[PDB]
Symmetry: D3
Subunit: 205 residues, 6 copies
């Protein structure tokens, strides 16, 4: 029709903490470490229904997320094998007549390491809809925020793959994605460069 | 002072619709047959004095009351039509608007999706679904309106004119959204009733 | 050193049951036609080791795992009857018990209430049902068994046999609960099937 | 950075009902009657992470609230000793290079008393996200809405202090702060007078 | 074969009680001045039927309906005393019990705690409190009854007799619990009224 | 005043992850790492009200948990310095007239390390009332069940002291206490060794 591709973001193999987080937090069918994964945001939001039905029928792919927000909607599919995910992705692009590149770039609205987290700051992040692991006092904190939000998952994945960090929280919905990780001062800075390179990769497309 | 955005009067509520309202409302629970009046005004803080007025006028019961970012919704209902309409005219008289000064009802989505898969059916059933269970194999009617509250009258008629099942009605925020299930033939007919109901709202 | 409370096998999940566990389970989700298996052992904490044993033996998925006070519940499921049966036999070998060492399924309530009041339907819908809404004027069948886990299989053969609407299944704790809706002829036929399944089970 | 000061609201002594409301609706460390309190809203909202770390390391103050919204974010510190609270306050002000007066003015969105509340009106307010006390039918109802949201906590403290009213609810996030208090006609009238007197003092900055 | 566990008749609801019930009840909601009736029966599941009869009898609404593992609780209420008394008499004739057949109300706890510390008020406030806020420095009446259904009538009389504030009345389970705030004098009056009400109840 | 003493467990310094878990799910004042901690279960469980008033009113101690159940009640107090916690203990103990050894023995109802946790099994543990860190597939899992429940907190404390494990969960209320810890095959057996150790002492009363 007139569907704007806003996020197309593809992870070929989910890192273990990231998949575990999606499994625990997800309202749909659950992924496990190693599953390929496709995140998509389109506008208008309601178009997520037709596209999800198209994606689910083409392959053996399973639906992980589906949400209709005000201006846009989000869907995520995932399968043990890369093939089905990209095969369903093509279907979605061919139906909306968009190339992947027609996607929106990924603004970095906040990127920061915070060293020596107080126990009060940690307690606060840990009580507020925290579905991942416990942020612990004294450790360092990578925090990142993007616009659009869907990209935070892939950023989060490359962070974990590149650095011995612990995943605290991935908020992938709404207008702004947000990723919180914990680790030593040195681990978290590795996590940050990678995620910045991953973001660098997307923008060039 | 006050602007009237939604004014949607339902003279008698279909059983599923009323049952769903009763199952999700945090007010006084409607039953099938109840008359029912949806009103959204702006600023949102006004529904307080406005609900006070409607409630003090008649024997009518308050079903909903939400004050949102830019506007608020209020919902009254009673087994006697005249009580609901009487409260309605009283609310209009306070804000000094005619039932016609409401915003038109724009359609932001109308679609049927045939042969729903299990996965797609479950995601819907698992997230904010307080109605009945969407089942794989059936066709899905989905309807989105701006402003939201009109979706209730559209949901009500579509249950009258067609043999469909209520999955979900979300009547708050900027966008109303509706999900009904059934045979391709049923859900197409449920779409026409909603298309018609909206058209009559547009005539104001 | 473990006692085998519930063993219950379902070769092919009825659609509405699969959609209900899919919408209410905190594990991996089933689709219609899936094969399913329900286990309750005592001590309760035995379910972890057994879920490890069963998950490793095949491609089967884990739909529920709950350690309760007296005992512990677990539910595996797969698209093929073979992986479900293969994993259940492994769990039997490990606890050193045959399938018929399970406890009998005691019916502790069975009743059909025709012409459900709207108030009565409204209360049942509000109190945490994840299924379909109980509509007023229709007939209700409620059943309750001890132990709970069998209720899922009774819910399954009841949908197999009768054109009812599932409303609520509760498979954890001491007593299981089934809630169905339909016409009198529909609800009567389901209660008959459900009764028949439980007699089947009690033959071991 | 280019951090923006939106709300700087200092309370010297927390009123009992208000302290008790915050101890019940907040997800941090909890306040008691008499604690000094400071509420800061800054833009962009991810900045509240560094600013909070700065505050907990400067003094012994504790963290009550920490919330990141899309365009802005909000924090709240408190300690028995007002010293520590204003000290931690100045440390935040130095990092953002903003004086207290640089804060946004408090505009009144809504300001109403409604007499003789019906039982149905009362119930819906009691049933939706109210964490203060029950609103009873017959009594009068004072409702105040302010923009930005953070100053509603200072109006709520001054209202409770000046008049014998009951706190029903204070919502201090989003764009608009909303406050619900119950009393007689006279009690809510005094409370409403105290509210606007505090908003005007603030707006002298 | 139904055992009358509780039968507690409230002629008229005090506003904090009525307000509390309306904010925490999952069913239809009361207002100050309604009559109101609590019933516990065994077995639990018998409450559906007994709700069914009570609603048919008069114009009474259904306030609460909860099926515990061993017993079940229902709550009907109406603006007028006539309809509650009549609808309850019908419940009694069905189960073939007089009101006297109800279980004596025992007091498992009755205590005032004066000058409540902040951390104590805060823990009570945050954990399942739907009444008004408990503030520090004040006195706290707590009462625990067995059976639980009576704590509601003890909460009515206590509020009626003292100038106290209602914090919580949890009326399900085996144990009733009441929490109320006030000066140490008002809480001692609220407790003595409660004590007397139970005495009057077991006088029959 | 006829009060049974069911659990009396003193924790001299809360290990970091355990303090952080209590903090995420505590509904009183939150403990920070390093705090001392005293868990008490008494029957009739309505008695924890006075016993918390006594304990609070005697020292700087803070109330972290308090619950009334059918057969008993549980309270927990905690503070920066151990002197206050222990003193409040004696105030409590003398108020109910029992000594520290009048506590029930702590029977170990289940103890197991399960190696190579599958993703499915890890996911379902993560989805159900999990408020610690993510259990991750392939790692080993320590599980512990005690009766009464309050001791699982010292067992969890000690098992974090002696071992380099991760805390996933600790259900410290009801009849039975349940504890889920993660690590390699070496870290979980050490933790379990600490766990058996600490209970052995508790059983000497």
């Amino acid at each position: 029709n007139n569907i704007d591709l806003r996020v197309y973001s593809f992870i070929d193999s989910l890192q273990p903490q990231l998949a575990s987080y999606l499994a625990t937090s997800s309202q749909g069918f659950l992924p496990v470490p190693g599953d390929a994964c496709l995140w998509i945001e389109v506008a208008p939001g309601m178009a997520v229904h037709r596209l999800s039905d198209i994606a689910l029928k083409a392959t053996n792919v399973r639906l992980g997320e589906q949400v209709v927000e005000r201006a846009f909607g989000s869907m995520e599919i995932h399968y043990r094998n890369q093939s089905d995910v990209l095969a369903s992705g093509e279907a979605v692009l061919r139906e909306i007549n968009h190339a992947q590149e027609d996607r929106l770039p990924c603004r970095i609205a906040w990127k920061e390491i915070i060293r020596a987290i107080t126990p009060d700051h940690a307690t606060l992040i840990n009580r507020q809809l925290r579905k991942g692991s416990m942020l612990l006092p004294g450790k360092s904190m990578f925090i990142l925020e993007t616009e659009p939000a869907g990209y935070i998952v892939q950023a989060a994945n490359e962070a974990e793959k590149a650095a011995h960090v612990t995943l605290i929280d991935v908020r992938a919905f709404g207008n702004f994605g947000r990723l919180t990780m914990m680790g030593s001062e040195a681990e978290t800075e590795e996590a940050m460069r990678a995620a910045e390179a991953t973001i660098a990769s997307i923008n060039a497309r």
